[PDB]
Amino acid sequence: MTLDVWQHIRQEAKELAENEPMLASFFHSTILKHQNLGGALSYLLANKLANPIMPAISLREIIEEAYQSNPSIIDCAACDIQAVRHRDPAVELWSTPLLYLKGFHAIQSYRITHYLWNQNRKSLALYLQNQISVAFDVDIHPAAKIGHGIMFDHATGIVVGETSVIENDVSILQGVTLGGTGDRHPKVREGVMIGAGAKILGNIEVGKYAKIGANSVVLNPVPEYATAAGVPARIV
Amino acid sequence: MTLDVWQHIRQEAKELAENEPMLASFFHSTILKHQNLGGALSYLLANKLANPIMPAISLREIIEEAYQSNPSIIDCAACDIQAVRHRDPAVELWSTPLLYLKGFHAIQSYRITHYLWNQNRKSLALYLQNQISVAFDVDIHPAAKIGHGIMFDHATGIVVGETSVIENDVSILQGVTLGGTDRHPKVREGVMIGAGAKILGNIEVGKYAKIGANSVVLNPVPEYATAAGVPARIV
Amino acid sequence: MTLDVWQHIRQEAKELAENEPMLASFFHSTILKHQNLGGALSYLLANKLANPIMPAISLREIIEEAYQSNPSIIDCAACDIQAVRHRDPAVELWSTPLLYLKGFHAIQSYRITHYLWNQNRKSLALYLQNQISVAFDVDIHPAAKIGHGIMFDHATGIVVGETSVIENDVSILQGVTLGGTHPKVREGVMIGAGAKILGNIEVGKYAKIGANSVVLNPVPEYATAAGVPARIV
Amino acid sequence: MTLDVWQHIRQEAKELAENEPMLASFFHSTILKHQNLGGALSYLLANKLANPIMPAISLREIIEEAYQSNPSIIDCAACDIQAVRHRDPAVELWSTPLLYLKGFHAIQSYRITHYLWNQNRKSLALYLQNQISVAFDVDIHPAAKIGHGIMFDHATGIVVGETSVIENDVSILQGVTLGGTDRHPKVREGVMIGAGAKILGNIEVGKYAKIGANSVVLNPVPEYATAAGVPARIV
Amino acid sequence: MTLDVWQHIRQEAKELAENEPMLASFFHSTILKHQNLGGALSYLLANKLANPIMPAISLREIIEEAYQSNPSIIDCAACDIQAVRHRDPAVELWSTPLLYLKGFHAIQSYRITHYLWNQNRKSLALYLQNQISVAFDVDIHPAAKIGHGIMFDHATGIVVGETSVIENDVSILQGVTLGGTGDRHPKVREGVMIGAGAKILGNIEVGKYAKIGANSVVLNPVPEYATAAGVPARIV
Amino acid sequence: MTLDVWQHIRQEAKELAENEPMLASFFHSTILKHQNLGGALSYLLANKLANPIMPAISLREIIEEAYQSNPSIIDCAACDIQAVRHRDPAVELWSTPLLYLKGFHAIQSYRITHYLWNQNRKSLALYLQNQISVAFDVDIHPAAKIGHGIMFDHATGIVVGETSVIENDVSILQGVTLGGTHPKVREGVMIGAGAKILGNIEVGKYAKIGANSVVLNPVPEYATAAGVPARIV
Ligand SMILES: CC(C)(COP(=O)(O)OP(=O)(O)OC[C@H]1O[C@@H](n2cnc3c(N)ncnc32)[C@H](O)[C@@H]1OP(=O)(O)O)[C@@H](O)C(=O)NCCC(=O)NCCS
Ligand SMILES: CC(C)(COP(=O)(O)OP(=O)(O)OC[C@H]1O[C@@H](n2cnc3c(N)ncnc32)[C@H](O)[C@@H]1OP(=O)(O)O)[C@@H](O)C(=O)NCCC(=O)NCCS
Ligand SMILES: CC(C)(COP(=O)(O)OP(=O)(O)OC[C@H]1O[C@@H](n2cnc3c(N)ncnc32)[C@H](O)[C@@H]1OP(=O)(O)O)[C@@H](O)C(=O)NCCC(=O)NCCS
Ligand SMILES: CC(C)(COP(=O)(O)OP(=O)(O)OC[C@H]1O[C@@H](n2cnc3c(N)ncnc32)[C@H](O)[C@@H]1OP(=O)(O)O)[C@@H](O)C(=O)NCCC(=O)NCCS
Ligand SMILES: CC(C)(COP(=O)(O)OP(=O)(O)OC[C@H]1O[C@@H](n2cnc3c(N)ncnc32)[C@H](O)[C@@H]1OP(=O)(O)O)[C@@H](O)C(=O)NCCC(=O)NCCS
Ligand SMILES: CC(C)(COP(=O)(O)OP(=O)(O)OC[C@H]1O[C@@H](n2cnc3c(N)ncnc32)[C@H](O)[C@@H]1OP(=O)(O)O)[C@@H](O)C(=O)NCCC(=O)NCCS
């Protein structure tokens, strides 16, 4: 439930603020003063994507309209907090992905642009896409397709092309590019783990549960449950 | 030509603001309220490079002085919008590169630093270079020589060394380093460099050559050739 | 000495402000108005990590708390300045690393998180760790151990894991990752641009890792590892 | 009625933005991009009351909650634009009071604090009262009762005590104090108070009375009368 | 000359910065890095009138266009710095009125709105008029007529009506209102000194070199060289 | 005691933050995260006097320099808090003056300028004097002498001249001017709203000045002066 992840987050925030006086204001502003995940998420995103030309107050108006028109966007977020939570040894707090992980922020921001790109509000989608790249150093074309339970660990330098597909429970590290030389982008299936720096190019298939070596340059489809590594990548 | 690009850009901004109420203010303050490309660009770049210590208002004075001093800088920008637009079917509006692409922004901010360095105003050149690296995550030394018709698509992690040169119509993708092992690469016109490529040393990359993603280029590459691999060999 | 490096910085800032009118304000605010490196460094760092939710005035309180508690943090900063200075003919001024190099800023910022982490103030360490990623495009777990004379040249995309150890005088370029399949990089080493060093493995003193290498096996002292996967070359 | 005022306001903003390129962004972000009076007002008031500690984004949440909770607040605002517009020939646009008059802003910010005080959220009421005093230089205690059709022309230095009441269609000018020597004034409808006037004590100021500039009112004033002087006598 | 007042100001700034390290940045930003009075004045005004909706960068664009279209506006400023300079015992520095006096800033800002009101750019004039009131607590209707050598000492609460006239070398203190009950506003002649809190109402004449008591309520014309005081004011 | 008033403030802030979710952040930033009144006061003041040219982080350095040099400045602040508290049934919390009353902020800000003025750092005193006018609509020359237990209620439009002297426990309302045709206001006095006291003249202990009065002649102890011009009434 969005309300159960939200419950853990609220309870954690209360504690964390009691233990860290220098951060209490922060916990109250992002979480404790909000009523639900969307309120906290939109407050967080408006502030992070904010700039001199489009202030946090104006960015938030945009994000809230999107959450109001399609509430499931928020649900995708709760599913994303959960995934990083146990697909990451160290992340034990539910509030950690929500508050600090730029890959998480990048994905949730992207979901906003995707909804917008589907409403044919492309100028708005392109504006956000690029502010997402400036703030988080993640560039996902609004038209790309991405499922839930997604993890962009560290995230710096991740580039996802216009025709890319990313299924559920995929994990992507820093420096990964999904791109090409119509469909000229990868179709990364369920559960795939992509190592740091890997460049996946072409309308090729990366089968469910496959693993990609760090720095690979994958050009040929990768079988399900297989490991692809090397430049160019071979099944290993 | 500036006037045509600018006019196309202006006509676009009008229709776009008309169709997207939420961005109307953005279109008006970045483009519509300005009279020429120079004013729109210096407005955007100052705001994107601004920080608490050097606010947009103060950085705009620097940018303006450079534009008033060397007007051809704005030209190179006009040529870059042109390239990006055509050389990337995806981009289908004159105003997109101006408004949204950080690679484009980083190059134009760079042309400003290059001028400052050529005028012996290095502390200013250095400050900007690094603010450019913070904003757009593109680090181009000010003494690097770069032509026009340049495309830094995505751009994250690009690093260009001090003695590098980049001729016209070159396209560079994310994570590309032009650096050392004169100690940096010389990229001739029409070269396409793939994502992640590391090109090391004062070596020649011939015109219209293609560099594969993640390659590590150590020896010269032949014009029209294709280099891929770690080390890069010809394929 | 922190007082030595500081004197050099003040002499330079005074002339730099003299020669560039449009930047004099900047030199006075970061350097000349302060009385020591700690004051300049905390001001610079608070301002760069600042955001709408936690402004510079608030972040500085945190950094100053740390510097007051452990003054040696500032000493490591003075040591890292020389390194980027001597280890790089491309940088000649003492104040250049302090003022403009994001890799340097990311390292000094990390040192603050590392101290907090060790005081068990982990939420503050995590908050900063991630603001460091946003501001400088560098992600170093506060638990990582990093000695001094460190140089993060260009820095973009550098990622260092929770159990990584980086000894003295190491240099690390853009796109470098130290983590798991975390690394132990001995003194004087380095990790060339785009290289990924993965696994509980050791990189010997003065070894060299080649651009875009993928290191999975230990690397010998003074050895040059390169390739995907890395091979002694 | 809100819908007519709002629609008039919107039609005005369109033409104005059309005629003044430099303010087009302002008109779009304050009015044009919003769907109702509530959104435009909460946007303006949050931005005008914002400070480094409580940014516009955070103050807007408070304002929104109050508007969603007690919708009639926005109404009183609509009635105040109406008054000002007509009761001051100088003002000749529905949008001017909304956009430019700080007296109008201070009253609407006040209605928010009054609601918060009535909901026993005093620390919030107190915070705003004082931020209102900083922004607009108008200090209205939150427990003061104020009707609609109110005009605070110029408004600088206005101070309204805790037990004050102000009925409909009252106009108050700069430097006016409604305070003590229940300990504050009761201003009936239609009263016009001149600049600098100090009205002290729980005394009645009858409907449609006129108070001269710089007067000091200590005894009750008769309806339709005119009080002027220090002390004020009837003239 | 605008260039001589500017010369004193520049030289003073250089010294003042050398003597006050904690303010050096300020002296460099407002004065020393600028080439002329207009550059320094517009930088100062854009920053002071700035707000979340219209940032200093955008306000400055407006002010610079005005100075470019009518450079004499700047000259009026130099004449104003001079007047406060010796019509005020304590003010010995030329840079003091320029940098710190809100009445001075208020007047110079007003001159911008007056030029704009004459170009029929009323929405812009009204916007500035009111931001001037918010920042400096001075409200001068753009249509009012005001000469040079003007001093708004302290300035808080000064209100100047739409049809008011203020001639050269007039001095006005805090709390002064020029207003009314067509011409329904005062015509304050050359050299008049108006005490704090005085309310001058009606299309009445205040003769050159007259003096107005603090807190007066002037309703009848005041003779040249005379003193008016009281509520209502009498010639005394 | 500053420690007494501080304890009261912390107890209140803790409950206030408890009862109002939308303001908890504010209470933690101004009060709870700090360890004493000086920390809270400088944070509050730096933030209110901040502007694009001199941000809060920069103004705080100046205030802290002053508080470090003359800790007693903070003691006068604690004393002024009680005054607004006891001298006003409309204010009941110790933290209300510290948090929300601009007259109080203007007074404490002035004290900083007064100290600088006396250290001969007049440009800094003048800069602040005028930022105080912009932020709080109060203009007090740094050279003015003002004792403690001072209450500037509502404050708007208050103007105090260079040679003015205000002793202890005085209360001054909005629109008040102390200057020349500067005043000497003895202990416990006051100056009602809109009153203008002009000339090198004396206002006696516990005297009362009526709203909009124009005082030109000395006023006797316990006397009530009112009128334009003021007359003993
Ligand atoms: C490929 C990977 C996923 C492990 O998968 P695996 O199925 O266990 O593969 P193995 O370890 O069995 O090794 C099989 C072959 O792959 C090679 N190999 C492993 N990783 C490689 C890489 N990144 N590039 C190229 N070759 C690689 C091995 O040397 C081995 O070769 P061999 O058959 O000649 O002996 C892993 O090595 C990797 O690259 N992980 C990236 C994780 C990462 O980026 N972490 C950073 C954390 S911040
Ligand atoms: C090299 C490249 C430019 C295509 O060039 P090309 O002229 O078509 O050369 P080819 O595609 O015919 O490839 C020839 C050989 O190189 C190999 N190769 C291709 N790209 C390679 C790369 N990046 N690294 C290593 N080998 C590569 C192929 O497997 C092929 O092998 P073969 O010997 O069996 O014939 C391209 O594949 C590439 O690397 N593009 C990067 C673009 C990018 O980064 N896009 C991201 C967009 S966000
Ligand atoms: C490791 C390094 C620092 C110096 O290496 P070295 O000890 O001098 O080794 P050499 O230069 O003699 O090269 C030896 C072999 O390595 C190969 N090699 C070198 N760098 C390589 C790389 N990155 N990937 C793959 N092979 C590489 C050479 O082709 C040579 O091949 P050989 O066995 O056929 O003789 C350097 O080669 C390198 O990669 N530097 C990157 C620095 C960088 O990132 N700069 C960016 C500045 S922004
Ligand atoms: C009193 C006032 C409202 C007019 O009311 P009115 O009904 O016309 O009363 P009158 O004008 O006939 O004045 C009658 C007497 O009051 C006196 N008077 C008028 N205004 C006075 C004032 N503010 N204080 C003292 N006496 C005043 C007149 O001199 C006149 O004297 P008389 O006995 O010789 O006949 C008006 O003069 C006034 O004070 N207006 C203030 C408006 C203001 O502040 N405007 C600023 C706009 S920014
Ligand atoms: C009126 C003023 C300008 C002096 O002018 P002046 O021509 O010298 O007038 P005089 O002092 O000779 O006094 C003449 C009469 O005016 C009266 N008077 C003076 N100031 C008065 C005032 N503000 N209100 C009413 N009556 C006043 C005197 O009591 C005297 O009356 P008398 O003939 O019955 O004895 C002066 O008193 C004043 O009000 N100055 C204001 C300056 C100010 O606001 N300073 C604040 C600095 S921040
Ligand atoms: C002075 C003051 C504090 C108390 O005065 P007091 O000692 O009780 O004097 P009194 O109330 O007995 O009044 C005595 C005479 O003064 C007159 N008077 C009082 N205040 C006056 C004023 N401001 N102007 C002119 N005359 C005044 C009375 O009408 C009375 O006249 P009388 O001689 O015919 O008997 C008070 O009258 C006053 O003006 N307070 C203003 C407080 C304020 O500004 N509050 C605003 C809260 S935001």
Side-chain angles (χ1 to χ4, degrees), chain B residues 30-223:
Chain B
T30 59
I31 299 166
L32 297 178
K33 75 173 185 185
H34 299 295
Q35 268 74 43
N36 47 57
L37 193 52
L41 192 53
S42 72
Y43 174 96
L44 280 154
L45 296 190
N47 275 290
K48 290 171 174 294
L49 293 160
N51 58 60
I53 305 161
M54 296 290 286
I57 186 179
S58 297
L59 295 182
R60 205 195 187 178
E61 274 185 27
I62 296 165
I63 299 177
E64 303 270 51
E65 213 313 295
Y67 285 178
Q68 224 295 273
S69 167
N70 183 22
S72 69
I73 285 176
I74 309 179
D75 279 297
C76 296
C79 288
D80 291 337
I81 293 173
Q82 266 272 194
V84 166
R85 181 177 149 64
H86 140 262
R87 197 184 313 160
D88 202 51
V91 158
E92 55 179 316
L93 291 164
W94 293 80
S95 65
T96 294
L98 175 62
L99 299 181
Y100 318 128
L101 311 186
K102 65 185 204 176
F104 168 84
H105 298 140
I107 302 165
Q108 315 321 150
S109 299
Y110 149 75
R111 300 185 182 299
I112 292 168
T113 81
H114 186 61
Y115 184 63
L116 287 170
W117 183 272
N118 273 340
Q119 311 325 297
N120 214 16
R121 300 182 63 185
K122 297 182 168 166
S123 55
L124 199 35
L126 288 167
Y127 176 78
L128 294 170
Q129 163 195 12
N130 292 278
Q131 195 54 27
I132 295 177
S133 184
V134 170
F136 318 126
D137 203 11
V138 178
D139 186 340
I140 306 172
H141 187 92
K145 280 146 191 168
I146 310 173
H148 63 285
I150 315 294
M151 177 174 72
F152 281 8
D153 190 19
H154 305 297
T156 294
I158 282 180
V159 179
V160 177
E162 176 167 22
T163 59
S164 307
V165 172
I166 300 178
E167 300 194 349
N168 317 325
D169 313 329
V170 178
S171 309
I172 301 187
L173 287 157
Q174 59 265 19
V176 165
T177 291
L178 296 179
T181 33
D182 229 320
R183 59 178 174 299
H184 308 302
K186 275 60 199 181
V187 189
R188 303 304 156 187
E189 62 176 307
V191 174
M192 305 162 231
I193 302 196
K198 307 296 188 282
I199 299 176
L200 313 174
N202 172 48
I203 55 171
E204 288 281 315
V205 169
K207 70 198 222 295
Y208 305 84
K210 291 181 202 161
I211 308 306
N214 287 355
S215 303
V216 179
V217 184
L218 310 165
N219 15 270
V221 194
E223 319 193 341

Side-chain angles (χ1 to χ4, degrees), chain D residues 159 177 179-181 200 216 218 230-231, chain F residues 153-154 173-174 192-193 208-213 224 226-227 233:
Chain D
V159 179
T177 291
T181 33
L200 313 174
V216 179
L218 310 165
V230 185
Chain F
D153 177 36
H154 304 304
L173 276 147
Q174 62 270 24
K208 294 182 286 193
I209 306 309
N212 286 0
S213 286
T224 287
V233 309

Side-chain angles (χ1 to χ4, degrees), chain C residues 1-2 4-81 83-85 87-233:
Chain C
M1 187 29 81
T2 301
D4 281 320
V5 172
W6 187 234
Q7 296 291 195
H8 277 101
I9 292 173
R10 290 194 59 88
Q11 176 182 46
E12 297 173 354
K14 232 171 297 181
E15 311 235 16
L16 292 174
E18 284 182 359
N19 304 0
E20 184 49 82
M22 314 300 267
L23 206 51
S25 63
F26 172 78
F27 293 122
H28 276 285
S29 288
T30 56
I31 307 170
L32 303 167
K33 75 172 185 179
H34 297 299
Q35 297 173 38
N36 49 68
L37 181 57
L41 188 58
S42 70
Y43 171 97
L44 275 154
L45 295 192
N47 268 286
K48 293 174 177 290
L49 302 163
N51 52 80
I53 301 172
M54 296 283 289
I57 185 171
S58 292
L59 283 175
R60 201 193 197 184
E61 284 184 30
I62 296 166
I63 299 167
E64 284 197 76
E65 206 178 55
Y67 286 179
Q68 189 112 185
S69 283
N70 184 4
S72 78
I73 300 160
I74 308 164
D75 299 319
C76 277
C79 184
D80 290 324
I81 285 170
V84 177
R85 219 181 74 80
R87 302 227 289 279
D88 194 25
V91 167
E92 69 269 48
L93 292 159
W94 294 84
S95 65
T96 280
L98 173 65
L99 294 175
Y100 323 118
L101 309 186
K102 75 179 173 181
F104 172 85
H105 296 142
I107 290 161
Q108 308 333 126
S109 291
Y110 144 79
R111 298 193 188 289
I112 296 170
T113 76
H114 181 65
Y115 174 67
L116 285 162
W117 183 263
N118 283 336
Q119 298 254 281
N120 188 54
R121 300 175 64 190
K122 311 199 175 195
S123 67
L124 202 39
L126 293 179
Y127 172 76
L128 297 174
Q129 169 202 359
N130 293 283
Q131 195 52 43
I132 288 165
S133 185
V134 168
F136 311 140
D137 282 314
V138 176
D139 185 344
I140 299 168
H141 193 102
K145 290 181 195 62
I146 300 160
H148 58 233
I150 311 301
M151 174 168 98
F152 274 20
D153 177 36
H154 304 304
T156 300
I158 291 176
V159 181
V160 175
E162 180 163 16
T163 68
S164 293
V165 181
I166 303 177
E167 302 197 336
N168 303 325
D169 298 314
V170 171
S171 297
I172 301 175
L173 276 147
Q174 62 270 24
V176 166
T177 291
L178 300 171
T181 49
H182 296 326
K184 277 63 180 188
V185 183
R186 299 300 164 202
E187 92 165 21
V189 195
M190 182 292 318
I191 301 110
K196 307 289 187 292
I197 316 183
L198 321 176
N200 179 45
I201 53 170
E202 275 225 36
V203 186
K205 315 212 315 300
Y206 304 87
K208 294 182 286 193
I209 306 309
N212 286 0
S213 286
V214 174
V215 185
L216 305 167
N217 301 307
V219 178
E221 287 180 63
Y222 310 89
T224 287
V228 172
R231 287 289 108 66
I232 300 294
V233 309

Side-chain angles (χ1 to χ4, degrees), chain E residues 16 20-23 25-27 29-30 43-44 47-48 50 56 90 96 99-102 134-137 153-154 156 174-175 196-198 214-216 229-231, chain F residues 51-54 58 61-62 65 116 121-124 126-127 129-131 133-135 137-139 141 156-160 162 177 194-196 198 212-214 228:
Chain E
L16 297 162
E20 193 46 83
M22 306 308 275
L23 210 44
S25 60
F26 177 75
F27 291 123
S29 292
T30 59
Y43 170 96
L44 270 165
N47 277 303
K48 289 170 172 299
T96 290
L99 302 174
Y100 322 114
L101 306 184
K102 77 178 178 177
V134 164
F136 311 134
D137 222 352
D153 202 348
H154 300 300
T156 296
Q174 58 275 22
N215 286 180
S216 309
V231 178
Chain F
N51 52 80
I53 301 172
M54 296 283 289
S58 292
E61 284 184 30
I62 296 166
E65 206 178 55
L116 285 162
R121 300 175 64 190
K122 311 199 175 195
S123 67
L124 202 39
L126 293 179
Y127 172 76
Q129 169 202 359
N130 293 283
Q131 195 52 43
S133 185
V134 168
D137 282 314
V138 176
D139 185 344
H141 193 102
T156 300
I158 291 176
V159 181
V160 175
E162 180 163 16
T177 291
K196 307 289 187 292
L198 321 176
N212 286 0
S213 286
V214 174
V228 172

